[PDB]
Design a protein around this nucleic acid. Structure first.
Ligand SMILES: [Mg+2]
Lengths: 105, 675
DNA sequence: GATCACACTACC
DNA sequence: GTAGTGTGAT
């Protein structure tokens, strides 16, 4: 259910998409990213048709993150109409994520 | 004999006022203080010691006190004051001769904390006086509530300054007596604090006289300066800067930026077991933050939700770690590592790196060019010691020279180091060397550029070796150098394919060329290099004999003696029995070149030529086996060149050298042409 | 099997 | 400012 983005597919998959898209900027060497990954998998399946969860690995795709001023990871950016609607940084739990989404959707 | 010191308002270049001076007279055993209005009486006292055929002791007087007094006497009193070289003794010069195995802060210009080894105590105190005075001054000001301004402690005379001046002489006297107690340089049967100047130089070891003449001459050389073409370097800098930017533009496109952990406070701990995970990047755990305040909380953090602080890093070609990171990702497997375990990333290694991505392979050449460009920019313009930062108002660079800075007796150069200007054979070397030249100095009367005489000692290292092996081969090697062809002789001795291979091979033994570096001359490694050395030595028994004779005087790692006797009799400290022969060779060459430039200047002056820009010639730089001399006319340049050859022959005869010594001179407008 | 100055990064 | 690495010259 999770969309794996690339720098070259970002503009089309995120900025010009319909409906809400949650983007997770992560790296394999980050402990916290590893913590939330399992959480995002369950969120994608639970919110399908309601939300699209996508991931962008900042090591293999170095061009995008800088444009959004990433300063920490994981960084969850909620996009709506090609604009960043909301943003949270850190390994939130299932509940903090669910309430973050429900609240912003 | 008298010991003395002065305090003035600035460094030699801009000193305008005498603050005070102190004189200790051994004949009366009394200290006398001279305040600002006693300047004329101070000079009178110094001239009275000269009238008696006496001696004047200063610590660093050759470079500062003596020329400062001449300058200040003319400026403040309209008086001509010129202490003769023969009447002056310098305890700093003496210390550098006797304690040549020790470093020193060169009167506080160097941070004592960064020097390796121990430091002689009295000299340490003398070098630190300025800094100690400044701290007392600053302390006293603040105790009274007024602001301290950089350098204000030297603007006016005050009694604290006078007290430091007295202490200075007290310590200089102590230092002096400690140095005169060294029986190797000063015969114990003579009291050197009770003799006239002629006795002092004639009864002390020859090295004492030579080091003072060298320091006197090099102080003059520093004052002369090396004429420098500022505009040319400013234009070279624009060119280099533009190329640097273009290389960076190309390299940053090829090697993209990335993120790295940065600013993490706490350690990442496994969420389930709690096991600390020291290797993971450090994290931060928001103390505040939530989803709602319900009104939404538009803050980025959530209390308890950890994250890893990171920073964006752009590829930096000057970073050998960035280079290593990107090349390994491109498939490079390092073979050479450093003690700290880091992969070696130098030009030789980079030359050998092979990665299959064409663009990244080509980018390695861009990286090597970038490192070289930066090297040039740092030396000429951006470094703390860049030429553009040191060129003075007179259009000259006045580099400092420590006449006996190295253990072997070689001089050291700094601020900036004029002995490390890129050679004409290296990238941009021609433009660098061309910017240093007599042509850039316009005569004070006629406005016409001066000309340059560049003179070097011919193959000095091999002739020194020939000299020392003459005891074993009866001059065979020396005979081959000056009559046959020593290079092809060594080529056969070794086995190397061509003559030039032998020239590289021979210089190799001299300038740290290891076995791998040797075999690497014929296209191989260690073995073909470890065999070439052995073969050479078996076919040149005299060198083997020399080596064993040198070590038998040093070893039995128990030492029989930790020093070798130099050509002028001084002790030359030997660091390793293995470095003994090179220590012996480098020392001989250094002393030969030192006496040579001293004798050359004396003969020119004997011929009636005046040393200085207001005269006929000016020493501009002395770089080990070579001197660059500015000359008012081409005719003088010719005389200097001929005189230098005469002086070299005089030196060879003076020390009964077994190999004939020679020089070669070239006349031109700058250092590029006079190479 | 040499002597020495100095710059640039990375870290405190 | 210090430690580690390299380059500039003989
Ligand atoms: Mg002084």
């Amino acid at each position: 259910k999770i969309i794996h983005l690339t720098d070259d597919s970002f503009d089309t998959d995120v900025l010009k998409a319909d409906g809400a898209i949650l983007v997770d900027f992560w790296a394999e060497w980050c402990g916290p990213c590893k913590m939330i990954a399992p959480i995002l998998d369950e969120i994608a399946d639970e919110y399908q048709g309601k939300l699209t969860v996508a991931k962008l690995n900042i090591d293999q795709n170095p061009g995008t993150a800088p444009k959004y001023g990433i300063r920490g990871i994981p960084t969850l950016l909620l996009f709506k109409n090609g604009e960043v609607a909301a943003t949270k940084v850190g390994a939130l739990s299932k509940g903090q994520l669910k309430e973050f989404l429900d609240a912003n959707l | 004999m008298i010991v003395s010191d002065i305090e003035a308002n600035a460094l030699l270049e801009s000193v305008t006022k005498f603050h005070c001076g102190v004189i200790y007279d051994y004949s009366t055993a009394e200290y006398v203080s001279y305040r600002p209005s006693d300047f004329g009486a101070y000079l009178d006292a110094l001239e009275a010691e000269v009238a008696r055929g006496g001696l004047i002791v200063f610590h660093n007087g050759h470079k500062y006190d003596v020329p400062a007094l001449t300058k200040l006497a003319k400026l403040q009193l309209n008086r001509e004051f010129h202490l003769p070289r023969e009447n002056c003794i310098d305890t700093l010069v003496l210390s550098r001769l006797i304690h040549s195995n020790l470093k020193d802060t060169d009167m506080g210009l160097l941070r004592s904390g960064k020097l390796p080894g121990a430091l002689e105590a009295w000299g340490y105190r003398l070098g630190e006086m300025k800094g100690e005075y400044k701290d007392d001054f600053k302390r006293m000001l603040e105790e009274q509530g007024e602001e301290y301004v950089d350098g204000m402690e030297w603007w006016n005379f005050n009694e604290e300054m006078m007290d430091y001046n007295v202490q200075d002489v007290v310590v200089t006297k102590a230092l002096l007596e400690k140095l005169l107690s060294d029986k190797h340089y000063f015969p114990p049967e003579i009291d050197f604090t009770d003799v006239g100047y002629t006795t002092f130089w004639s009864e002390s070891l020859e090295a004492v006289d030579i080091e003072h003449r060298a320091a006197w001459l090099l102080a003059k050389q520093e004052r002369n300066g090396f004429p420098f073409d500022t505009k040319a370097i400013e234009e070279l800098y624009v060119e280099l800067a533009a190329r640097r930017s273009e290389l960076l533009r190309k390299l940053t496109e090829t090697f993209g930026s990335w993120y790295q952990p940065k600013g993490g406070t706490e350690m990442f701990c496994h969420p389930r077991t709690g096991k600390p995970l020291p290797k993971y990047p450090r994290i931060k755990t928001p103390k505040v933050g939530g989803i709602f305040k319900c009104e939404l909380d538009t803050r980025e953090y959530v209390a308890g939700a950890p994250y890893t602080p990171v920073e964006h890093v752009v590829f930096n070609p000057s970073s050998r770690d960035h280079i290593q990171k990107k090349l390994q990702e491109a498939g490079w497997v390092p073979t050479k590592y450093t003690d700290k375990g880091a992969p070696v990333v130098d030009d030789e290694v980079l030359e050998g790196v092979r990665v299959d991505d064409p663009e990244k392979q080509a980018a390695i050449d861009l990286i090597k060019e970038y490192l070289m460009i930066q090297k040039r920019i740092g030396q000429s313009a951006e470094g703390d010691k860049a030429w553009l930062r040191y060129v003075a108002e007179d259009g000259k660079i006045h580099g400092s020279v420590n006449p006996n800075g190295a253990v072997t007796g070689r001089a050291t150069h700094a601020f900036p180091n004029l002995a490390q200007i890129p050679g004409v054979r290296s990238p941009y070397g021609e433009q660098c060397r061309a910017a240093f030249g007599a042509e850039h100095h316009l005569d004070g009367i006629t406005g016409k550029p001066w000309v340059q005489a560049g003179i070097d000692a011919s193959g000095l290292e091999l002739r020194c070796l020939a000299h020392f092996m003459a005891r074993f081969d009866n001059g065979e090697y020396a005979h081959e150098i000056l009559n046959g062809d020593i290079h092809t002789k060594n080529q056969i001795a070794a086995e190397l394919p061509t003559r030039d291979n032998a020239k590289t091979f021979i210089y190799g033994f001299l300038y740290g060329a290891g076995d791998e570096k040797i075999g690497q001359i014929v296209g191989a490694g260690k073995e073909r290099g470890k065999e070439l050395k052995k073969k050479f030595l078996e076919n040149t028994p005299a060198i083997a004999a020399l080596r064993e004779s040198i070590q038998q005087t040093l070893v039995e790692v128990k030492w029989k003696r930790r020093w070798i006797k130099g050509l002028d009799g001084r002790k030359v400290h030997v660091r390793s029995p293995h470095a003994a022969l090179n220590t012996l060779l480098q020392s001989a060459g250094a002393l030969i070149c030192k006496l040579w430039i001293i004798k050359t200047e004396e003969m020119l002056v004997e011929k009636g030529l005046k040393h200085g820009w207001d005269g006929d010639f000016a020493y501009m730089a002395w770089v080990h086996d070579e001197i660059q001399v500015g000359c008012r006319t081409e005719e003088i340049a010719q005389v200097v060149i001929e005189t230098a050859q005469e002086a070299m022959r005089w030196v060879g005869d003076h020390w009964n050298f077994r190999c004939l010594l020679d020089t070669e001179g070239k006349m031109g407008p700058n250092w590029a042409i006079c190479h």
